[PDB]
Design a protein around this nucleic acid. Sequence first.
RNA 1: GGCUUUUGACCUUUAUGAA
RNA 2: UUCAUAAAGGUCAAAAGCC
Length: 349
Amino acid sequence: MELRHTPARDLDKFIEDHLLPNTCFRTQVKEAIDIVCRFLKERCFQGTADPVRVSKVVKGGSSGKGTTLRGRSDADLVVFLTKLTSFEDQLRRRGEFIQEIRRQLEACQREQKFKVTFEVQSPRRENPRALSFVLSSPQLQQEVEFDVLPAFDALGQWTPGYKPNPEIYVQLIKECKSRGKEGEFSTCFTELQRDFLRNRPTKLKSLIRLVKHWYQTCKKTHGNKLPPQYALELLTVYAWEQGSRKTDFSTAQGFQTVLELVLKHQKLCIFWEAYYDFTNPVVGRCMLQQLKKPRPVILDPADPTGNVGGGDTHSWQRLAQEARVWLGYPCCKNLDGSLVGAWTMLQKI
RNA sequence: GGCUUUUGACCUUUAUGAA
RNA sequence: UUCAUAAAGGUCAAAAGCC
Ligand SMILES: Nc1ncnc2c1ncn2[C@@H]1O[C@H](COP(=O)(O)CP(=O)(O)OP(=O)(O)O)[C@@H](O)[C@H]1O
Ligand SMILES: Nc1ncnc2c1ncn2[C@@H]1O[C@H](COP(=O)(O)CP(=O)(O)OP(=O)(O)O)[C@@H](O)[C@H]1O
Ligand SMILES: [Mg+2]
Ligand SMILES: [Mg+2]
Ligand SMILES: [Mg+2]
Ligand SMILES: [Mg+2]
């Protein structure tokens, strides 16, 4: 049945039956990703006399994190290009490389290698960050949607578990402040975003799937007037880190905890020191400034300039109205009708 | 306890692109 | 050598579903 009719003790069964990827979906998506990556490395940029080269194509998003929803999660690919040499360079020339990727895709389509359908683009967006399309192929048993983002390799060859050289963030901050573009270059650090989730406990990822499904259900009512989905993913990590830190926990208690955190968005000030910290005075000052913003502040662990909170209080107002409604559903209720109870939050300093 | 899936960790290999 | 995407082999763990 639907999530809103599902009692607390059946949440994990709901996640299993509807949210966890099945073998065909994830294998088909991987096959499509291989198709696109091979295209990006072996065909797409071979047209130019001055070799533009792909240093890496990173599978980011839920696909790289292992937090996908069965049959509903896209493939988010950040394609790093050697010719993009700075954040400035990325901001101004990403449109060029986007159009060229589009051109070569359409070229391959004519050759009947595969079929591509490009997104609505209702707003001009001014300067898009992604090339969004649906991929069809004779080898594929299903369509797969893609977000392809050209980017400057700010991190270089990155070691998992290594803190980035703070000078990289110093440069990021300079460029953002210069152009008034905070949060603009998160794509450069998608590896850090992925790394922040990739090795988390299996059940934490299942809870994230649940919250993401809840979020998408709310999207039915409130359209696109909600806070970023990524904000809810980070809020769930926060809930677990302050309230559980265990591999085995109650899914229902975690879910209620997140719903209650949404209600307290006016008091949320969340950040991490996973990839940066207050040691560097420039980075520390940037972090401090973000932490002084109107609530909620949910700072991207990968990007000290990115408040994933979004800065739109109306968006959190609407989400909280849904959180209030859902706290009355069977989801967080025991068999006797009582709430399972949220986690006791430990104060993080 | 048994079966399986999902999610990672570690060690190898191939194709491809890069440094 | 390293990094990336897919595939192949091996080991380890976590959670879940079912019995
Ligand atoms: N507001 C934001 N600020 C910074 N990074 C963001 C962001 N929104 C999305 N991202 C990054 O881009 C990735 C892909 O975004 P989306 O594809 O829109 C949702 P997702 O996290 O992949 O889950 P889903 O695609 O299964 O719904 C996210 O995982 C996140 O790393
Ligand atoms: N850092 C990142 N890593 C991986 N994927 C990302 C990413 N940032 C963005 N994406 C993907 O690329 C898509 C388009 O990127 P953007 O143009 O930045 C979203 P937007 O136009 O600001 O609309 P929004 O208000 O929904 O965020 C996102 O929906 C996301 O799926
Ligand atoms: Mg995605
Ligand atoms: Mg996407
Ligand atoms: Mg596996
Ligand atoms: Mg090789």
